[PDB]
C-alpha cells in the first residue's frame, strides 16, 4: 500500500498522464524514390544548360563547343575534317555569341546534308524544334507556319526564324547553349508536349540520322492533325501498352459493402464532428 | 489416328481389347480366351490385322 502512498499519488495527479503524442509509423506501400527519371531521362530530368561567360580561358570554350555539337547533331560522330573550324575560332576570340555560333552551325552544309536533304520537311521542322528550341511542336498549325515560311523565304530564313524568336531569347539568351526543355511543364505549354518530346528524344544513345525504318519518318506528325494519340516509346518504358490494368486497392471492396457502410460512414463522420473524445469520464456506476 | 490416339495410344492391351469389343461389337468380353486370342494376333500380325 505504502509503496503506494510514497512512490505513487502526485505521480498520478496528471503527471501520470501528460499525454500520448508522437510517432509517425510507415507510409505508402510501394516503391519509386525519385525514379520516374529512369525513363532514360535521368541525365535529363532538368539537364544542366551550359552558360559561357567572358574572360573564359579555353577549357570552358571547348566544353561549350562540345555541348553545342552534342545538341545540334545529337550523338552522331563528326569527323575533325567536318568541324566548322572558322566558327570555333570566332567563338574562341569572343567575336560571336553562343547564339550566333549556333546560327553558323545550323546554316552549315553539314547540317543541310544530315537533316534537310535526308528527311521530309515536316520531320526537318520537328528536328529544328528539338535541336534549336529544345522542345516538340505544340500544334499542327506551328508545323504549317514553319513550312509556309520555308516555302516562301527558303532554308536560311527558316533557321533565322527559330533563333530570332522571342522564345529563344527568353530561355537561352545570347550565352547559353540550347538544352532539352520538353520534360518540364512551362506556363502556356500543352500537356501533349511532354509525350511528344519523349517520342522525339530516344535517350542519350539516340541518333536522329538513323536510316532504319522509323528515323526518317515523322514520329510526331502522324498524331498531330487530330484527336488520336501519344508517342512511340520505342516502347519499353511506356510499359508497352500496359492496357492500364487499374491500380485499385483491396479497399475497393469496402467501398462496395459500406456503400451501405457509407450510409453509416456519414453517420460516423457526422457524429465524430459533433463529438470529441477527449472525454473519458465514461462510467456512472450507480 | 482418331481411334488410335484415343483408345490405343495411351492404354494397355487389356483396355484396348475391351474397348474394341465395346466400340465395334457393342458388347463386353465374355471370357479370358477372347482376350488371350486377340492379343496373340496383335503381337503376331500388328494392329491392322
Amino acid at each position: 500500500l505504502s509503496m503506494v502512498r510514497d512512490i505513487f499519488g502526485r505521480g498520478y495527479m496528471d503527471r501520470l498522464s501528460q499525454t500520448r503524442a508522437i510517432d509517425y509509423s510507415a507510409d505508402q506501400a510501394t516503391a519509386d524514390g525519385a525514379a520516374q527519371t529512369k525513363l532514360g531521362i535521368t541525365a535529363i530530368a532538368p539537364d544542366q544548360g551550359v552558360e559561357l561567360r567572358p574572360n573564359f580561358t579555353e577549357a570552358d570554350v571547348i566544353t561549350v563547343i562540345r555541348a553545342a555539337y552534342k545538341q545540334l547533331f545529337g550523338n552522331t560522330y563528326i569527323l575533325e575534317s567536318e568541324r566548322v573550324i572558322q566558327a570555333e575560332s570566332l567563338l574562341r576570340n569572343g567575336s560571336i555569341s553562343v547564339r550566333e555560333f549556333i546560327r553558323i552551325l545550323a546554316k552549315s552544309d553539314l547540317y543541310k546534308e544530315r537533316f534537310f536533304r535526308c528527311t521530309s520537311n515536316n520531320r526537318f521542322i520537328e528536328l529544328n524544334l528539338k535541336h534549336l528550341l529544345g522542345r516538340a511542336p505544340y500544334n499542327q498549325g506551328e508545323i504549317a507556319e514553319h513550312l509556309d515560311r520555308y516555302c516562301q523565304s527558303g532554308y536560311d530564313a527558316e533557321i533565322d526564324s527559330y533563333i530570332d524568336s522571342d522564345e529563344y531569347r527568353r530561355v537561352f539568351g545570347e550565352n547559353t547553349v540550347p538544352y532539352f526543355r520538353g520534360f518540364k511543364y512551362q506556363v502556356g505549354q500543352s500537356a501533349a508536349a511532354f509525350e511528344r518530346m519523349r517520342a522525339l528524344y530516344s535517350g542519350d544513345a539516340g541518333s536522329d540520322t538513323d536510316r532504319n525504318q522509323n528515323g526518317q519518318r515523322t514520329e510526331l506528325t502522324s498524331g498531330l492533325a487530330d484527336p488520336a494519340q501519344p508517342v512511340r516509346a520505342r516502347t519499353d518504358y511506356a510499359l508497352t501498352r500496359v492496357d492500364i490494368p487499374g491500380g485499385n486497392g483491396a479497399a475497393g471492396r469496402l467501398a462496395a459493402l459500406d456503400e451501405s457502410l457509407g450510409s453509416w460512414l456519414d453517420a460516423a463522420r457526422d457524429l465524430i464532428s459533433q463529438n470529441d473524445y477527449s472525454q473519458k469520464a465514461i462510467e456512472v456506476e450507480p | 489416328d482418331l481411334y488410335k490416339e484415343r483408345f490405343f495410344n495411351k492404354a494397355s492391351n487389356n483396355r484396348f481389347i475391351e474397348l474394341n469389343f465395346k466400340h465395334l461389337l457393342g458388347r463386353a468380353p465374355y471370357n479370358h480366351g477372347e482376350i488371350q486370342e486377340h492379343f496373340g494376333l496383335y503381337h503376331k500380325a500388328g494392329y491392322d490385322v
Partner: protein
C-alpha cells in the same frame, strides 16, 4: 512420426546396418543446428497470437472472405479459421524442431485437401494465410533460424495446392 535422428535410424534398421560415417555425418548436421531451433520455437510460441493476428490482417480479413457469402463470415467460422491457423503455426513449430516434415503429413495434411473441398473451405486463401504467418515468423526469429522455420510453412502450403 519421425525426426531427423529417427529418420536415419529407421533407414538403417531396414537394412540392419550399424550407423556408419555417412549416417553419423547426417546426425551431426542436425545436432549442430539444434540450439537455434529451440530459440526459434520459444519466439514463435510466445508470439503465437500476434503472428496469427498480423497474418490474418495481411492475407484474410478486410475482404469478401469476412463478408456475407464468404467462408469466414459468422463468428463461428471466423473462430474455426483462426483456430486452424493456430494448428498450422503450432505443427510447423514441431516440424522445425524435429527437422522432419513427416508430422505435417501424418497429423495435418492427410485428407485435409478433400475435407476443405467438402466444406467449401477456400484452399488458395488458406495458403496465403500460411505464407503470411511465414513472413511474420521470419522477421521475429532472425538470420539464425529464418530459412529453417520457413521450409515447413512451405511444406504445408504445397501440401494443400
Amino acid at each position: 512420426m519421425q525426426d531427423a535422428i529417427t529418420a536415419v535410424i529407421n533407414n538403417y534398421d531396414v537394412q540392419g546396418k550399424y550407423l556408419d560415417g555417412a549416417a553419423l555425418d547426417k546426425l551431426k548436421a542436425y545436432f549442430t543446428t539444434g540450439a537455434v531451433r529451440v530459440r526459434a520455437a520459444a519466439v514463435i510460441s510466445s508470439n503465437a497470437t500476434t503472428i496469427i493476428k498480423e497474418a490474418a490482417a495481411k492475407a484474410l480479413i478486410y475482404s469478401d472472405l469476412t463478408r456475407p457469402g464468404g467462408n469466414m463470415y459468422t463468428t463461428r467460422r471466423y473462430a474455426a479459421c483462426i483456430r486452424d491457423m493456430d494448428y498450422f503455426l503450432r505443427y510447423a513449430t514441431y516440424a522445425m524442431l524435429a527437422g522432419d516434415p513427416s508430422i505435417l503429413d501424418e497429423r495435418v495434411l492427410n485428407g485435409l485437401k478433400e475435407t476443405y473441398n467438402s466444406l467449401g473451405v477456400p484452399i488458395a486463401a488458406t495458403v496465403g494465410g500460411i505464407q503470411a504467418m511465414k513472413e511474420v515468423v521470419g522477421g521475429l526469429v532472425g538470420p539464425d533460424a529464418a530459412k529453417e522455420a520457413s521450409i515447413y510453412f512451405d511444406y504445408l502450403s504445397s501440401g494443400l495446392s
